[PDB]
Amino acid sequence: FDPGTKNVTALLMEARELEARVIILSASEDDAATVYRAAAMLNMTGSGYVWLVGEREISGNALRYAPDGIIGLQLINGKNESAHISDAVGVVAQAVHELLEKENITDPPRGCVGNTNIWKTGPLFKRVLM
């Protein structure tokens, strides 16, 4: 759908008629709050409906109308800057170590500005790092 839907009640009426009740919102928090208000207006919040949303969809202003019980997946290692940074550094270190232990370790040329320094072993390097 397009962002900025005003006739959200028709969407809930169509979803209620169908046998499926898995309502998934992953666009933003404004549409999340809108569909939460639309579901609370018709008293169809949690009564058999599946609400699987993430932390980004509930951040800002999205839980002001949703009752307690909405399944909100918290973004693990997505916003923290205390231990997630160290975890990413360790992952990159282990990755470059395993890459150096393997083959295809040719040093690319000096990629300066104003010069064509396309790495000829790009796909091979990405396959080794994968």
Binding site: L63, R64, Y65, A66, P67
Partner: protein, 237 residues
């Protein structure tokens, strides 16, 4: 010009006066010898003894001058104060501690600047020891639903007989991150009943009350650290 006319008590530990004595309530209370004396580490002693105006500044009651220049008493008040002390500190032992003498004594100096105020500690019920406890009278007013539409919330909670110095309302909510949340609404201090309450007004909108949990003003102070969680079920009033 240093301090203006402030009809309040000692502002906790970091008081706005350089003449304070104790951060919390005074150790000696009504019933035994209570000493009240300010401090002055500047050029105050002019022509011998300094000119300090001693008066019982009680919140709500007009103060009456009883001892001037810390050496002679003022007419109109019976001679019941020990006007001793010289130099820097002027000790004033208060043995007749009645229901009106237990007030804050500001040593109004008349040497550097006449319109000034001294220190003094308000004598009240010492509810910060192991003898007496500060029972918080938890009373939550139910806010109406129509008032929440305009943005105002009648969620005030009474905190009668609490700790006025260390006002730290430790909320027992499931999740709350804030370094200080307490509306300063303490009334005037009194030594007769001491029924002053802090009206912590957490004004929130209608949509904010929906996601808000059970409003429970749990008081956790240094005096009485007892768990008092009054579960107030929100709803239409």
């Amino acid at each position: 010009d240093i301090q203006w006319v402030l009809l309040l008590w000692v502002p906790g530990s970091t008081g706005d006066i350089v003449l304070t004595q104790s951060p919390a309530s005074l150790a000696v209370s009504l019933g035994q010898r209570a000493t009240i004396s300010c401090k002055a580490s500047q050029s105050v002693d002019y022509d011998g003894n300094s000119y300090m105006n001693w008066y019982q500044q009680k919140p709500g009651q007009p103060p009456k001058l009883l001892i001037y220049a810390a050496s002679n008493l003022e007419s109109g008040i019976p001679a019941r104060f020990s006007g001793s002390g010289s130099g820097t500190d002027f000790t004033l032992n208060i043995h007749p501690v009645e229901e009106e003498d237990a007030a804050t004594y500001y040593c109004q100096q008349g040497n550097e600047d006449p319109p000034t105020f001294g220190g003094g500690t308000k004598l009240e019920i010492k509810r910060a020891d192991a003898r007496t406890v500060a029972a918080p009278s938890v009373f939550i007013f139910p806010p109406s639903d129509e008032q929440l539409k305009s943005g105002t919330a009648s969620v005030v909670c009474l905190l009668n007989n609490f700790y006025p110095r260390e006002a730290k309302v430790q909320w027992k909510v499931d999740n709350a991150l804030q370094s200080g949340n307490s509306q300063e609404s303490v009334t005037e201090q009194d030594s007769k009943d001491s029924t002053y309450s802090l009206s912590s007004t957490l004004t929130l909108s209608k949509a904010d009350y929906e996601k808000h949990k059970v409003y429970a003003c749990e008081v956790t102070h240094q005096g009485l650290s007892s768990p008092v969680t009054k579960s107030f079920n929100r709803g239409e009033c």
